[PDB]
Amino acid sequence: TGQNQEQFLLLAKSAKGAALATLIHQVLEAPGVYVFGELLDMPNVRELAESDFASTFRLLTVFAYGTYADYLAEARNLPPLTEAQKNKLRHLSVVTLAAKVKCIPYAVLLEALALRNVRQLEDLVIEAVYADVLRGSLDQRNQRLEVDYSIGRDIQRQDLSAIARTLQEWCVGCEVVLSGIEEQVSRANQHKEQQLGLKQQIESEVAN
Template sequence: MSGEPKHINQLEPFMLLAKNAKGPALIALINQLLEAPGVYVFGEFLELPCIQELSKGPNEGYCQLLNMFAYGTYHDYKAFKDTLPPLTETQKNKLRHLTIVNLAANTQVIPYSTLLKDLEVGSVRELEDLVIEAVYADVIRGKLDQCRQQLEVDACIGRDIRSQGMGRISSILSHWCSGCESISASIEEEVGRVSQCRESHLKTLQHIEAEVGNIRRMMSATPSTSTQDMDPLGEQEREGALAGSGAERRQTPLQMISKAKSLNNQRH
């Protein structure tokens, strides 16, 4: 979610101040941190040496309270409130926002009944105000469906993770990587199959084009040959007629006069 770097950056001033804070000053800084708008991650603050020392002294409750904001929910705080420092109203609402984030990380649709139970609010109006505050704080993105009485979540920030949970995350990521590799191999196999089909199609197309070219050449050569084969006699008669007319053109004038007299005598 795009809002996470902003929340992390707003933690830095408190970390710088904590390096020189001790005793009551450190307790006051912790209270300010838990009320500060925009600060919703606490893991780095918990790793500071001064906070580690705090967990071994009489004020260890504040270290536990920081752990509750980093990893827990409002319901968890209520279960251990007798051993933890009291919360201001602003701190309660921030822990409720983090509780909504915790729910949103596991499901995209959260019924009002679940929210009312986990946030321990007295009315739907108060619940909707809390959700709207969380949206404006950019810790979740979604919308309230008042008709269906549910919160539809689009995205949420990531919360701090305990060291014990890193193994589970590593397992999930390994499984995800294996799935990606399997999908990648399937895609490569499909690409190879498509390439083979394309090459086969191109070869078939080239063969068809060659056959079409051969047929066209045969058709263009066939008409002249077939005409001679179908009418050999007519061709011979035309040649004979041309030869006869040529012979007549080669007769001398005396031969022509003699031929004319002969025809005239035959008539008489």
């Protein structure tokens, strides 16, 4: 998303209670809008929390942080969604699965998205790749989804540290590899010169 961010933020700053409550149902039922981080952090939408339209804010929280199974567990409280919105939330659940692991079996996908047959799932993954949400390829025989690239959904202000926790884990990793080379290169010289020196001793005994 990018154009829709500005286009709906313009309307978000110029909207009130009920108009915002219906705007939430309009942003979730719109193609391309898979991130709601700027929209959920608005004071105008913060007013809707713990108010007359609380379930809509909870629905936006599920769409920005939770999965389709989390929606199914709280479907009695949350407002009803159409097939397009249910699909979108399923796409985002596949993104969460893809964020966890690279190779996703069909069983875990069928259980997490609440699907009955394989083609439904395959068609949803196609709809994902076609909406530029996921990249990858499907394997029928081994019944597995090979994920090449998945987008970012969750913002997580409190759990942000975890990102750094992995980034540092990569940094340290680099810092090992780098030093490794520095040492190995040094060794590669340490041998060479030594050997040359040794040869120069052998060659000095030819005169005797």
